[PDB]
Amino acid sequence: TLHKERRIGRLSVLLLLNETQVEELERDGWKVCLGKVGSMDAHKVIAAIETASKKSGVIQSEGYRESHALYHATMEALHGVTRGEMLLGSLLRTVGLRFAVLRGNPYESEAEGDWIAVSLYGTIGAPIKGLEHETFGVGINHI
Amino acid sequence: TLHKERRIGRLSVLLLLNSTQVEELERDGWKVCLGKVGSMDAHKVIAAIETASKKSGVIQSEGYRESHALYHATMEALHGVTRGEMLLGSLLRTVGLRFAVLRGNPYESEAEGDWIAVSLYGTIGAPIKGLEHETFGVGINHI
Amino acid sequence: TLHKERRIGRLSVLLLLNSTQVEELERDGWKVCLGKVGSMDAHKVIAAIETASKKSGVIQSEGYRESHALYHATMEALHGVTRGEMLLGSLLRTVGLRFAVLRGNPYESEAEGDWIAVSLYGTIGAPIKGLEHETFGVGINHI
Amino acid sequence: TLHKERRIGRLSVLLLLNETQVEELERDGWKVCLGKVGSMDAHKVIAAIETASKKSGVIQSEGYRESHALYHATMEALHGVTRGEMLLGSLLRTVGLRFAVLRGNPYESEAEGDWIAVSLYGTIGAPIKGLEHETFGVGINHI
Amino acid sequence: TLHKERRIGRLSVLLLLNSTQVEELERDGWKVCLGKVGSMDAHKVIAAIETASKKSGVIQSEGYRESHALYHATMEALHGVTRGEMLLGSLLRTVGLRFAVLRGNPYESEAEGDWIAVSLYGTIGAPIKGLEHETFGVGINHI
Amino acid sequence: TLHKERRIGRLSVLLLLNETQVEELERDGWKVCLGKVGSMDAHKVIAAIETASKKSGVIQSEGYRESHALYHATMEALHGVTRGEMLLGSLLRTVGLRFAVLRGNPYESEAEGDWIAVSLYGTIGAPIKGLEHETFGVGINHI
RNA sequence: UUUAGUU
RNA sequence: UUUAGUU
RNA sequence: UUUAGUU
RNA sequence: UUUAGUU
RNA sequence: UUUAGUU
RNA sequence: UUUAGUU
Ligand SMILES: N[C@@H](Cc1c[nH]c[nH+]1)C(=O)O
Ligand SMILES: N[C@@H](Cc1c[nH]c[nH+]1)C(=O)O
Ligand SMILES: N[C@@H](Cc1c[nH]c[nH+]1)C(=O)O
Ligand SMILES: N[C@@H](Cc1c[nH]c[nH+]1)C(=O)O
Ligand SMILES: N[C@@H](Cc1c[nH]c[nH+]1)C(=O)O
Ligand SMILES: N[C@@H](Cc1c[nH]c[nH+]1)C(=O)O
Ligand SMILES: [Mg+2]
Ligand SMILES: [Mg+2]
Ligand SMILES: [Mg+2]
Ligand SMILES: [Mg+2]
Ligand SMILES: [Mg+2]
Ligand SMILES: [Mg+2]
């Protein structure tokens, strides 16, 4: 069962929406990294999250295993952001995002190992400032 | 452009993850609605959000216009929750959700009229307590 | 290249939105079929088009080949009607349709053989009279 | 309920398939605009429809609200045209389209306000003349 | 990099299309599972693969972690089988499948840990013997 | 019913996974062609398969009919390879594939005419050698 | 869990 | 068309 | 509409 | 990787 | 197969 | 925005 005070999803979201909180999360054993990326190319959003996650040590820079888990978690988060077609520029739209990646065990059982959450918050709209509205996305996966 | 203090998406999410914070939102002019629904049938989730939204007065009980806006906002939020196949029971999975619906103008220009946000947060997993992880979804639409 | 006077897609649509215009189409060599179906189950819509198509002789009642072509043509038309999730009842929505199936060669070269078009037109909406709007779909396939 | 002689969907389609009809629609209070666009890039089809709709006055050129409604209506129409993957060039295919955008109240109740329909008709196929077949798409949304 | 003699995907497929080749795979350290399932309900296919996988010991019966990895691997394999809409009965089609689940490390580095492959092969078609053709799907995931 | 020793799907797969077999297939009346393509652009994978199929005579180089059947078969195979989003480069991923196209009648009834199968096998992953795993895809269609 | 099926 | 690739 | 669940 | 943008 | 429907 | 296109 999920540990009520270790909900990796809720935690990554609250962090993202509240502009410290990182040090507290880290003290509790979480691996954390925040970042911002904007683009009309989805691969760039994927790249920033991966680069930030590897440089901040949220995931191993070596091997495929952890990169694979993060890729699919990012994909799941992109579903919430794109809602239907995981396309930006080709569909005449752009995104301005802030992201958070959290890694750790959210379950009561230590045997559940580590899991990872990718959360995205920002705006999506036509490529013209103001013609936009909010967008959110959260992907969760086992590492 | 979006009004920094009126980000309907962010506000509906913060509320969902928390006192009558509703009182404050309502005092500021927002039409608010909170509820909970769990099921293996997506139509039941859609129904609870609609019913609760009409009963609380977040949208007009009469006409199609506002129901239509809410339905699509709900569909968009369901993308973040299902991430790929907007299916539950048929894919051997169930969802336990808490939801919020916020209606109002989030832009600086009052000419933008009302918009509506549907936020979902809970767990999704196999039909067995514990075999689950968090799920999240936000849909925004003009109304 | 497509024969200007034999645009199967356009012709099946015009027929659907209208005298036995069938007589004229049939005199020109087209195998035509018209019908109506309403439901909250997509499989019932697929079944009516198939049954009506076989009974009217638009496709062979024996073998798989022609049934296969029609099934995919129907799937393609269903995309225009559902626009995203080929789901009805499970997404708390219902459809009221009128359909047409036209079979024949729409190209200048007679070597292109027969092709089939499935056209759908009606309304889609919540399970409540009036809370609905139009829906449309066309699928084309070789047969 | 939908007004039988004000079916915005059927009307936009009939207009598109019949090469005047505009003046009659306009006299009845409809905001109308016709256009043609061909491309291997979906954003270009979206751009043409938006530009034509704004220049002809079918939607306000200012604000996001109406642009937002038109964007989603165009997206819905693209589902019928692409059927599965809202991709053209990346999937080695191209489209040659004619489009119509109609705006007005199709319901018996004046309270339903304005709605908008985006209709597309043309051909889709490999990037080689003749290797193609028809394609249709209709998206309907509230403004 | 992937170990030429340990390509889990290829191996699970070859097995599915064939003596206890299981014995050889097991001797090499692979956890293997073979089974068959037919249905018009995708959840029944997912259930048989899971049950058979846990009973045979391919994945842990306890905890969520490994069930989670298998569920997604199964979802991915279902994409190849359904190709578009992960639906069966609701789309008037049925499936007759044979499946294999292979677990182990397919990379040269032992640090990559275990991965899991789900392979499906059988027929898909209308609910009528003979009106069908082959279907195939492979899903791979870290575990 | 499908002829047990003429299963076009299984046959194309076995050929693809076993590095002759072509001459034997050809002697039995099958039209066959093997090839390899790698890219971050899906249209290139589609192009190689089409070019190889036409040059090797698996399908007529003239007319649309057979090109149309092959296009959709390739699309169906790509579902198994991409599983969700038929995108490569835009989603920061690349594929290294080997492909086989088989054409002939797999049914007991000669009246079923010719059918075609497109099979893909290789690896998919981030654009960095080693950070990848296997991927399969099979599409079947009537010609 | 130990291959489905009629409009 | 004659297997791709670094954020 | 006032959180779901076993193959 | 250290928030995008005009048809 | 001979247009659906309430949370 | 004033119908696209070769592997
Ligand atoms: N509203 C679109 C984005 C957009 C494009 N153009 C205008 N807005 C979405 O939901 O993604
Ligand atoms: N983890 C799945 C849900 C699930 C089904 N079975 C186990 N878990 C998801 O992301 O939706
Ligand atoms: N408007 C929805 C249908 C609907 C469901 N509820 C209300 N309307 C659609 O486009 O399919
Ligand atoms: N037939 C494809 C288009 C195409 C691409 N190549 C040949 N035809 C479709 O339905 O979109
Ligand atoms: N041929 C369909 C299945 C089917 C339904 N009806 C006839 N056949 C597919 O590819 O899934
Ligand atoms: N694992 C991804 C490919 C990938 C991209 N980056 C790393 N891997 C897939 O299943 O397609
Ligand atoms: Mg999951
Ligand atoms: Mg939007
Ligand atoms: Mg086609
Ligand atoms: Mg709608
Ligand atoms: Mg993967
Ligand atoms: Mg098929």
| DSSP string for residues in B24-35 | HHHHTT-EEEEE
Overall residue count recorded for chain E in this entry = 143
A110 burial (CB, 10 Å; 0-12 / 13-18 / 19+) is: exposed
The token duo for C39 is 């439901």
Which of left, alpha, beta for B76 (phi over 0: left; psi -120 to 50: alpha)? alpha
Cα dihedral C26, C30, C35, C39 in deg (nearest 10): 180
Hey, of B43, B66, B71, B79, which one would you mutate to test binding to chain C, going by the most C CBs within 10 A of its CB?
B43
Q: How far apart are CA C133 and CA D72, in angstroms?
A: 15
Give the position of tokens 């006409």: B63
Residue A120 carries which side chain, given as an amino acid letter? L
Whole-angstrom Cα distance, residue D34 to residue D99? Answer: 6
Distance CA B120, CA B115 (A): 17
C85/A7 Cα distance (integer angstroms): 30
Name every residue whose Cβ is closer than 8 Å to that of residue B93 and which is 6 or more positions away in sequence.
B40, B87, B124, B125, B126, B127, E71
**DSSP letter (8 states) at residue A89:** G
Name the DSSP letter for residue E110.
Answer: G
Write out the two tokens for A32.
């954390």
Kindly state the tokens that stand for C48: 């009516």
F35 is near strand H: CB distance < 7 Å: yes
Distance, first Cα to last Cα, chain D: 17
- CATH code assigned at B47: 3.40.1510.10
Do the beta carbons of residue B93 and residue B40 sit within 8 Å?
Answer: yes
Determine contact, residues E103/E58, Cβ cutoff 8 Å: yes
d(CA E60, CA A138): 27
Whether A133 sits inside 8 A of D42 (CB atoms) is: no
Q: Whose CA is closest to F70, among F13, F9, F107, F117?
A: F117
| B124 within 8 A of E64, measured Cβ to Cβ | no
E3 shares contact with chain A (CB less than 8 Å)? no
- CA neighbor of D56 nearest in space, from D36, D30, D33, D24: D33
- Classify residue F10 by burial, with Cβ atoms within 10 Å: 0-12, 13-18, 19+: buried
Give the relative orientation of helices D65-82 and D42-55 as an angle to the nearest 10 degrees: 140
Q: Are E105 and E115 in contact (CB under 8 A)?
A: yes
Structure tokens at D39: 């491309």
How far apart are alpha carbons F136 and F123 in whole angstroms? Answer: 8
Q: Which residue is nearest to nucleotide K1 (CA to C1')?
A: C48
Burial label, F68 (beta-carbon count in 10 A; 0-12, 13-18, 19+): buried
Q: At what angle do helices F65-82 and F42-55 cross, to 10 degrees?
A: 140
Contact D80, D132 (CB under 8 A): no
B3 and B110 Cβ atoms separated by less than 8 Å: no
Rounded CA-CA distance B45/B47 in Å is: 5
Give yes or no for a contact between F16 and F121, defined as CB atoms under 8 angstroms apart. yes
Coil vs helix vs strand at A31:
strand
Residue that has been written with the tokens 């007991």 in this structure: F108
Q: Which amino acid is at B25?
A: L
A-interface mutation test, from F40, F86, F87, most A Cβ less than 10 A away: F87
Who's near F53: CB < 8 A, 6+ residues apart? Answer: F33, F59, F70, F101
Q: Nearest 10 degrees: CA dihedral of E75, E81, E85, E90?
A: -100
Cβ(F15)–Cβ(F25) under 8 Å? yes
Q: How far is CA C127 from the centre of its chain?
A: 23
- Selecting from F64, F75, F86 the residue whose C-beta is nearest the C-beta of D130 gives F64
Residue E128 CA distance to nucleotide J5 C1' (Å): 53
Give the DSSP per-residue string, F56-122. Answer: TTSS-SSSSHHHHHHHHHHHHHHHHHHTT---SGGGT-EEEEEEEEEEE--BSSGGG--EEEEEEEE
Comparing CA positions, the residue from F74, F65, F45, F70 lying closest to residue D131 is F65
Q: How far apart are CA B38 and CA B35, in angstroms?
A: 11
Strand partners, D121: D98, D136
Distance of alpha carbon E94 from alpha carbon E81, whole angstroms: 11
| Documented resolution in Å | 2.2
Query: A134 phi and psi, to 5 degrees?
Result: -60, 160
Name the residue closest to the C1' of J1 by its CA: A48
The closest alpha carbon to B89, from B125, B65, B56, belongs to: B125
Integer Rg of chain C from CA: 15
In this complex, the residue of E1, E79, E133 whose CB is nearest that of residue F79 is E79
d(CA A117, CA A105): 11
Residue found by looking up tokens 């789900």 in the block? E118
Q: DSSP code of A112?
A: G
Question: Which residues 6+ apart lie within 8 Å of C83 measured at CB?
Answer: D76, D79, D80, D139
Distance CA C12, CA D10 (A): 14
CA atoms within 13 A on the CB side of B7: 20
Q: CA end-to-end span of chain E, whole Å?
A: 17
Strand partners, D132: D125
Number of separate domains in chain C: 1
Of D64, D71, D86, the CB nearest to A87: D86
D98 and B CB contact within 8 Å: no
Q: Which of C106, C104, C139 is nearest to C120 (CA)?
A: C139
Q: What order do you get walking across the sheet with B115-125 strand by strand?
A: B31-39, B94-104, B115-125, B132-142
Q: Count the Cβ atoms, other than its own, within 10 Å of residue D54.
A: 17
Residue E95 — left, alpha, or beta (φ > 0 → left; ψ -120 to 50 → alpha)? beta
Distance CA B30, CA B5 (A): 12
First-to-last CA distance in chain B? 17
Residue C82: C-alpha distances to residues B61, C13, C79, E134, F36 (Å): 25, 18, 5, 27, 37
Quote the CA–CA distance of C106 and C113 in Å, as a whole number.
9
Q: Is there a contact between A45 and A78 (Cβ–Cβ < 8 Å)?
A: yes
Instruction: For chain F, give the residues followed by a break (C–N over 2.5 Å).
Output: 19
Distances from the Cα of E15 to the Cαs of D111, E57, E118, in angstroms? 64, 18, 12
Phi-psi domain of F108 (left: phi exceeds 0; alpha: psi -120 through 50; beta: other): alpha
CA angle, residues F130, E25, E59, in degrees to nearest 5 = 75
Helix (H, G, I), strand (E, B), or coil: what is residue B95? strand
Q: Output the distance from D82 CA to L3 C1' rounded to whole Å.
A: 16
Name residue D26's amino acid: E
Residues of B in contact with E81 (CB under 8 A): none
> 3-state class of C101 per DSSP?
strand
Classify residue D129 as exposed, middle or buried by CB count within 10 Å of its CB (0-12, 13-18, 19+). exposed
Contacts of A114 (CB under 8 A, 6+ apart): A103, A104, A105, A142, A143
φ/ψ (deg, to 5) at F34: -115, 155
Count of residues in chain D:
143
- Pull the structure tokens for residue F112: 């079923």
> What does the DSSP assignment read for chain D?
-B-TT--HHHHHHHHHH---HHHHHHHTT-EEEEEEEEES-HHHHHHHHHHHHHHTTSS-SSSSHHHHHHHHHHHHHHHHHHTT---SGGGT-EEEEEEEEEEE--BSSGGG--EEEEEEEEEEESSSTTSEEEEEEEEEEE-
Determine the Cα–Cα distance for residues D138 and D136; give it in Å rounded to an integer. Answer: 7
3-class secondary structure, B75: helix
- Cα–Cα distance between A10 and E14 in angstroms, integer? 43
**Closest-approach residue (CA) in chain A for F86:** A86
Q: Determine the 3-state secondary structure of C1 from DSSP.
A: coil
Atom 3 of ligand 4, residue of closest alpha carbon: D125
Tokens of C38: 């309403």
Structure tokens at C137: 């779909």
**What are the two backbone dihedrals, phi and then psi, of residue D85, each rounded to the nearest 5 degrees?**
-125, 115
Give kind and range of the element (H or E) at residue F37: strand F31-39
Task: List residues bridging with C125 in a β-sheet.
Answer: C94, C132
Q: Chain D within 8 Å of A89 (Cβ-Cβ)?
A: yes
* Other CB atoms within 10 Å distance of the CB of residue B35: 16
Q: At what angle do helices B65-82 and A65-82 cross, to 10 degrees?
A: 180
Strands (DSSP E) contained in chain C are 31-39, 94-104, 115-125, 132-142
Tokens read off for D3: 């007004």
Residue B78 has a CB neighbour count (10 Å cut-off) of 25
| Chain centre to alpha carbon of residue A122 | 12
Task: Quote the tokens at residue E60.
Answer: 């842990």
Residues 6+ apart with CB under 8 A from D128: none
Sign (positive or negative) of CA dihedral C49, C51, C53, C59: positive
Nearest Cα to Cα of residue D127 among D91, D77, D82: D91
Residue E69 CA from chain centroid, whole number: 12
Place of tokens 């270790």: A6
E142, E114 contact by CB (below 8 A): yes
User: What sign does the dihedral B85-B90-B91-B92 (CA atoms) show?
Assistant: positive
Q: Are E137 and F10 in contact (CB under 8 A)?
A: no
Sequence-distant (≥ 6) Cβ neighbours of residue E94 within 8 angstroms: E38, E39, E40, E88, E124, E125, E126, E127
Among C1, C4, C13, C5, which residue's Cα sits nearest to residue C140? C13
**Residue C82 contacts by C-beta under 8 Å, 6 or more apart in sequence?**
C42, C88, C124, D79
Position in ligand 1 atom list of the atom nearest CA A132: 8
Question: Which DSSP state fits B6?
Answer: G
Tokens 């939908």 locate to: D2
| Dist CA E101 CA F110 (whole Å) | 36
User: Burial of E5 by CB count in 10 Å (0-12 exposed, 13-18 middle, 19+ buried)?
Assistant: exposed
Total count of residues recorded for chain A: 143
Torsional class of A21: left (φ above 0), alpha (ψ -120 to 50), beta (otherwise): alpha
Most informative mutation of C93, C97, C123, C128 for ligand 3 (most atoms within 8 A of CB) = C93
| Alpha-carbon distances, residue F59 vs A80, A137, F26, F62, F63 (angstroms) | 41, 44, 14, 9, 10
CB within 8 Å of B83: residues ≥ 6 apart: A76, A79, A80, A139
Q: Which domain holds residue C94?
A: 1-143
φ and ψ at A63, to 5 degrees?
A: 75, 170
Closest residue by Cα to residue A83 from C85, F79, B93: C85
CA gap F35, F77 in Å, rounded: 15
